[PDB]
Design a protein around this ligand. Sequence first.
Ligand SMILES: Nc1nc2c(ncn2[C@@H]2O[C@H](COP(=O)(O)OP(=O)(O)OP(=O)(O)OP(=O)(O)OC[C@H]3O[C@@H](n4cnc5c(N)ncnc54)[C@H](O)[C@@H]3O)[C@@H](O)[C@H]2O)c(=O)[nH]1
Ligand SMILES: Nc1ccn([C@@H]2O[C@H](COP(=O)(O)CP(=O)(O)OP(=O)(O)O)[C@@H](O)[C@H]2O)c(=O)n1
Ligand SMILES: [Mg+2]
Ligand SMILES: [Mg+2]
Ligand SMILES: [Mg+2]
Ligand SMILES: [Mg+2]
Ligand SMILES: [Zn+2]
Ligand SMILES: [Zn+2]
Lengths: 96, 1370, 260, 146
Amino acid sequence: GKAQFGGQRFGEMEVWALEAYGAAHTLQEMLTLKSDDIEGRNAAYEAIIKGEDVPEPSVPESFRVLVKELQALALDVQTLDEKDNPVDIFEGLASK
Amino acid sequence: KKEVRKVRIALASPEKIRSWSYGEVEKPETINYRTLKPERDGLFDERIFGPIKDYECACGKYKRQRFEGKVCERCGVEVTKSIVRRYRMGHIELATPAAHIWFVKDVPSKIGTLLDLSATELEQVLYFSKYIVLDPKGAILNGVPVEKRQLLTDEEYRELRYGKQETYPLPPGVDALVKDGEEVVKGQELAPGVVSRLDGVALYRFPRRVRVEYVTEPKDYRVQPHMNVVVPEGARVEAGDKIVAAIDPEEEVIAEAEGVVHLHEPASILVVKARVYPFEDDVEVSTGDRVAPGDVLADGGKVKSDVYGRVEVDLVRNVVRVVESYDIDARMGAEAIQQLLKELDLEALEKELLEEMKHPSRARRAKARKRLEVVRAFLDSGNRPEWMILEAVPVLPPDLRPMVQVDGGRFATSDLNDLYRRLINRNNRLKKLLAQGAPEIIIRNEKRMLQEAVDALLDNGRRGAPVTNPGSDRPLRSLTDILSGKQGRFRQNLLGKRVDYSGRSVIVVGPQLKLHQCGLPKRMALELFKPFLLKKMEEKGIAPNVKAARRMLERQRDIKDEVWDALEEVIHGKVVLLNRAPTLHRLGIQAFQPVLVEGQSIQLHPLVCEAFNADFDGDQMAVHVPLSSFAQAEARIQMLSAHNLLSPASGEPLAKPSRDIILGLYYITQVRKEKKGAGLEFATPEEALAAHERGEVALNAPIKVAGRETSVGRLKYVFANPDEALLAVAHGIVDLQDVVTVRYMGKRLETSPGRILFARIVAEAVEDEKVAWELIQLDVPQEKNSLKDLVYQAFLRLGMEKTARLLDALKYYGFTFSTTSGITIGIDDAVIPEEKKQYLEEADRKLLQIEQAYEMGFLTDRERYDQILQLWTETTEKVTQAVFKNFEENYPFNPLYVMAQSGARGNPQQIRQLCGLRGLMQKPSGETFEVPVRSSFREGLTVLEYFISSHGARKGGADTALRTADSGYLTRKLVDVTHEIVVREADCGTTNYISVPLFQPDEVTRSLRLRKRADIEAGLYGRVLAREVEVLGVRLEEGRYLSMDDVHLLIKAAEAGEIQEVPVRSPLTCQTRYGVCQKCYGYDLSMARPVSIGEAVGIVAAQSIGEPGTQLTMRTFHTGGTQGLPRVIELFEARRPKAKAVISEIDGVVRIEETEEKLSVFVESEGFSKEYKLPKEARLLVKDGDYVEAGQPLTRGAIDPHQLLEAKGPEAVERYLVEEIQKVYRAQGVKLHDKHIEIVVRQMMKYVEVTDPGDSRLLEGQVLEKWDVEALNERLIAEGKTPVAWKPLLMGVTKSALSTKSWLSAASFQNTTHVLTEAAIAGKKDELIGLKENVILGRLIPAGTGSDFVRFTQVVDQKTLKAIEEARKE
Amino acid sequence: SDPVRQYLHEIGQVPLLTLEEEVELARKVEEGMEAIKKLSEITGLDPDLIREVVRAKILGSARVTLDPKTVEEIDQKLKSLPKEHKRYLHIAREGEAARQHLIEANLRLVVSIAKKYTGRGLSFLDLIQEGNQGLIRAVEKFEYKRRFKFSTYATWWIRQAINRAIADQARTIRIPVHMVETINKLSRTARQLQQELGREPTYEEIAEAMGPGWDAKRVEETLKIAQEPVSLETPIGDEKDSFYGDFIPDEHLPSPVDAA
Amino acid sequence: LSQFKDETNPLSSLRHKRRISALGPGGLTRERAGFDVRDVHRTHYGRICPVETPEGANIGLITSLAAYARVDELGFIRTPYRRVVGGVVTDEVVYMTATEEDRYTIAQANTPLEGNRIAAERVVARRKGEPVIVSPEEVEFMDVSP
DNA sequence: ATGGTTGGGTATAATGGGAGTCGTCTCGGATGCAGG
DNA sequence: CCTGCATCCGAGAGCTGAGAACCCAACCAT
Ligand SMILES: Nc1nc2c(ncn2[C@@H]2O[C@H](COP(=O)(O)OP(=O)(O)OP(=O)(O)OP(=O)(O)OC[C@H]3O[C@@H](n4cnc5c(N)ncnc54)[C@H](O)[C@@H]3O)[C@@H](O)[C@H]2O)c(=O)[nH]1
Ligand SMILES: Nc1ccn([C@@H]2O[C@H](COP(=O)(O)CP(=O)(O)OP(=O)(O)O)[C@@H](O)[C@H]2O)c(=O)n1
Ligand SMILES: [Mg+2]
Ligand SMILES: [Mg+2]
Ligand SMILES: [Mg+2]
Ligand SMILES: [Mg+2]
Ligand SMILES: [Zn+2]
Ligand SMILES: [Zn+2]
């Protein structure tokens, strides 16, 4: 919304159009650096303010929310590397 | 940090939940009511979930960093970042186990399938309506022994557990006919009006009086309700002993002497089915103990129990009564279900199901396979079935269920907090009530509500009334509601997001812009490029540092002049993305170079409006700013407007002249025709010249001189060059539309100065005179089709840069000439022909005849209605023809006629409605009115005619409103079925192909006629030749891409009978995994060149199919005198048609057998003869004694695709589906290549069903992917076993999408609960192959620049390259 | 479905009682209580422990803090009583059975009392369960010598339990009992003042009618503390596409501008 | 049904006060309403405007009261007609419901007149919504105005 | 040492609830019933 | 025993913008 100084919604069909163009990097920017990659958007703003190029994106926070909500339904959702070993996308903040 | 490559989902054990949690939440308290701090052991406790403040405990002992990982002793809060409050889980320990509703209510039930329990049986057991028995212990029910897994109701269980007994009351004043302690047979009356109904011993309840003897004479003692009798019936008493104990010591009844004691006048009788045992000393078993036959009962073992039962020691009569019962172990609810699930042995059950799979029964085998699927999923995943029952319930982190203070000071909460509170309350009350030893009824009630609370927390509104907050009827939003739906997490936050660096505004036409430019408001650019602007102003002397620049830019009156120049510096060379909703195709987003403008409106180029489907009556557009070098390069190279001139769907130009541009070019390129001369004869030119000069012949009249057709203008005005002719035009000597003679290109052309001017425009635009002369058609007026063909040919011959330059030139000159042409619309421009009046009067004649033919009897009602309708439609057609004939003959420059002919605006129907008449109208039921609207819009309608047409207008509006949603749904289904298909390799190496026909059979005359050229172009253009073709002395080699000229050559050759079909590669025969190859796909239709490796052709195909359906299919419908989208949706879903026709399953000859009541068709082969009984009213496409092939239709209507698959095979179904889908789009005038439908159909035919598993572990009837079974068969051949035997299947787009391997895409598509539960049981691992999964993960999609084929490319200059070798040369 | 009908069916499957049967059952439970205290003083063991073990034996192994071996060994240890003492055990067991039977018979009184407390933040079944707890308490503390009917003493305990449940579980943010009753009395005084004045009272009138120690600031503070939070999922607008939480920004995590 | 009043101009408020809605508590649902309830019925003539309706998902579900229409005490919309006797148009005006209207032959308001007698041998009329051509004697009622 | 918060008690008799919802349409699978 | 045939239940249905008892006494917290 304009009253909330909000941003435009990049919905499903816009993502379809970007995919049809083959613009992988623009779409990844829209998904992470501009919406909900917190450290990513912070680093991007700092890099632009300092004159460098924007850094590589990370996992968006909405995926972490999805994982946490799937755990609430007693479902073990786990991300694995190339050798099927667990990869911690929470940086260790949720491990006892 | 290792990259993520796979995501696994599986069931969670109670140990896993306890390992996740940082502590158990013990109380339903959320926060303190007065200090607004979280309550201890609550749903927001910092001890469990983490601190609210950064690096500071709750009690304030530690308020600094460096304390990470240590827990404060006073408060119990670890000192760390507060963000951990959105990651850390909790748990609740349930007093009794509860079932996860996803595994109970998702049909077919997984638990019910595992335990072989029906849905009603599980409903009964889980929710405490019936018992389920374990270890029956040899109990007898109704004479039949009880076996495990048997359902007992409450009364049936109670009778077996406790024994049968009843109580019969006795009215006051009426005694019984029996004694105390005697056995009673069923039916033995105990009173004059009381009759027993069960067998067993009967005992008195509350005798009213007691008779005490004295050693004789008797005595009576009254027994009041408040005092009780102690002495046994018929037992002696001693002096001083008590008989009737009372509340008051002085009121007790004390025996005076020795005598027997008897009890009489009972209040009721209790008849039980039990054994009785007197005793005379201490007993061994007390009340409430269960015994077996032959156990010690009393008298130190003198008496022994003879039956199973429960003992009660009646001390009043000093007798042990053993009620016949059992120690049966029957349980109800999730505890019993979990006990059953634990005991299940999967290997033995699998062996039993494998043995069952040998039954000749098809249904029994199918059900055995259904059970075996779940069993094998559990076996392979390693999950334990008992994990399906919850013992510990996970608790979501508090930050995802916040309790926040709004700006008004009030608190806002999530429904999850209330659901958790309800669950915790019921659990705590259950624990308290269990600690008190409460009766079974209350425990059953409490456990019922606990199960319901767990259900509401996991899935609210599934069984029964959903839980709502008091004072409202809004259902509470459960976890499943959060996860799924259009409003759920997947579709609302993962597949689409709101973004930064974006804006939106109204759009206005930008006629002075170039094709690659867009007008962007100054303030919009200031807000969009703010960080780059801050860097630029800090670099200059505008501000000392970034903070000062921000402070300057935050106040409007604090902005200066040099910052605008800095902004112009910032955006130099950069592009922005413009998007208009709905984004139907990929050209709904385009990249433009921003030109800073004043005002608040975005300025849009006229030539991109058609691609955007945008007009200027209030439309708005969104603006986005790509940030990095990669994003800017992608936008400038791939998504720039000037680089996208051809449609990805058809290959035809999409950025092309329209509206005013067409009008102006047509106006200047049309030639004037006059009738003053009208074919006069002259022997020499000079006499004709003098005749014109004296005023008898018009300049453009078609005269004949010396045997040659010519005009006075051709002879009088001969110009040496175009410059001279245009100079004469500038002096008013001739008009742009007059036909003169001009010398151009070394030739003498009789043409008009306007056409010469158009040729010069094109030649100067493309900077090439010979090519421009080749491209244009000089001798015709320039209209929409000719201009589009010119744009396409210029593209092919010159490239995108010169084509865009030519487009800009055409736009400029079209606007300029449309301004000064004098195009206007007045009321007199809607010319009404005279013949219309005649055409009406003649009709008024015929109508009378029809009425007469009905008033005398030679006509029925239906025929009269039909003849009236046919008369009126023919009259309307005649009026249309007259209107356009009048326009062509008398007013060739009429504005409406010019607009309709040039293609700028309007079609003949609208022109007729304006000029001739509106015609017939339809009633709301769908039938036509009898009287038509005989007035046009110029004449003005009457009130009745207006109201009659209102029905059709409203119906068209409703059509649009309620069909656009169905078309959007179809587009989404196509995207979710084809999103994974990408161009992944140069050549798959296959030798299979398809044969595109050039001649279509006809139902009438059964003859082959050449197909429409548009259809052949849609089916052949851009494809790769599978085999060599020799036509007209021309060799088309193998591996050749068919250009448009090649397609035209093939059509020309086919018209001579030299070729009948074309063999081409196709996606239907491609062998690439998860996609296609370059050769099997062909051209990139938007670039007229072979497709690049890495193109996401599945998304392109889905958009190409979906976009025309959204607007142009059965746009504004005009109410004027199995079809459309429903037929297309039926074909894409493999729906069985309701008007289904009948096909022949086998070869043979036709013999129709028709009797006066019934009709049948026999197909007689040489081996067999089959029959088809058909309704007499059905239509027949064949005749008696004709030959039909297998799968050939015998009736009119839609063909069932699955029956055709069984009859003819897979390729026939592919061809049928492609052709039948193309029919609907062709009827609408939509050009769309066959490749997109071929891709979707290839996805539709992805699966096979096993008929014979052979030596594999597969099961009969198991559906699986074709690739996997082919690979399995190849490996079996390598090992030396028998192959698996399979048959192809055909599935709709929805079921094909939901049957995919990736659980992320299927979960984000539809039916989230079912997909998630099946994947969790199976332990599925997602390999992230498609686009949707990578979008959900926020990764780089494997398409375009993210393709592995191109994304590892390196770039280096010559200087660096050599010295790197000089290092290696060492 | 419809769990209320299922509970009503199960509760109606148990027949009612007459005065004579009621007084008989109460006398039996009274003598069982006297028997367990007599046994506890004889053996020197905690009365609660022996009551729990005796009731565990009366229920059976179906009712699983005390290991089965422990309760069984205690049961055999009570089998060492010569005479005039096993009578205490038998009387206690019959009293426990009487307690169960009386509770089952009079659960309908709980239903009747609780059916007029609906619509106050707790569902009907929760009210029924809290009333059942109160009825168990009343059965525990009933004295039948007074010849008073069972319902006369049970009703007070049932109503006390129900009112306590409303005070303690009705609100997502817990408010103590004294503040809850203060709020109810404030609301009642406000409605009487509205009835008398013919309009909404001002804070001065409510403070005056409360009594000593009540002023307008205090009533304003009470009314501010008595507000219940709204849902983040409240639908905003006519169409079913906007929630309340769509208008709530995060003020905790630093902004990108702040971080730099 | 209680809506924030639209007062951009006086005509906006006047339009808002005369709106008829098929939605609301105990009404239809926007997304599942079929063509049948959104169609201009033949009985809408003179009672509900066939033109003014919102484009989009609400087409046919929100409509407007006709200019001369009046809702009676029972809730049925009535429209006025002039009584004609013996081919002479009178000034008596009768407000009628759709059921009563179904029983008569009603002439168009633009029927030519001399004084107040129908001066036309062929009269365009409605019979149960069907357009017909009748003789002046068969006419029972006439429209008040377009 | 003070308020704020929490646990316990009341004794004629009382003994099975109450709002609600009826104008979508199709489609696909699971299933019980009818026939042979 | 097999099969087909109504029957019932569940899951879908375009995008963007905006909009109601009272009292009394003991007991931890700060
Ligand atoms: N993708 C898209 N594009 C649309 C749509 N509809 C119009 N366009 C474009 O806009 C141009 C001008 O169209 P319009 O001449 O119709 O003007 P408008 O802006 O739509 O305004 P209204 O006449 O509707 O006035 P209002 O007072 O009723 O607006 C308030 C009420 O309208 C409705 N409403 C207003 N704004 C929108 C909106 N953005 N989206 C959807 N519904 C909207 C809504 O129901 C609201 O509650 C057209 O040409 C198209 O390019 C649409 O549905 N989707
Ligand atoms: N719900 C909607 C309504 C509209 N639109 C978009 O707005 C355009 C114009 O609709 P419109 O009805 O404003 C005019 P149009 O059909 O072009 O006009 P004419 O025949 O009277 O000249 C459509 O083509 C869609 O792209 C949409 O996406 N969703
Ligand atoms: Mg528009
Ligand atoms: Mg338009
Ligand atoms: Mg000359
Ligand atoms: Mg609109
Ligand atoms: Zn601390
Ligand atoms: Zn291939």
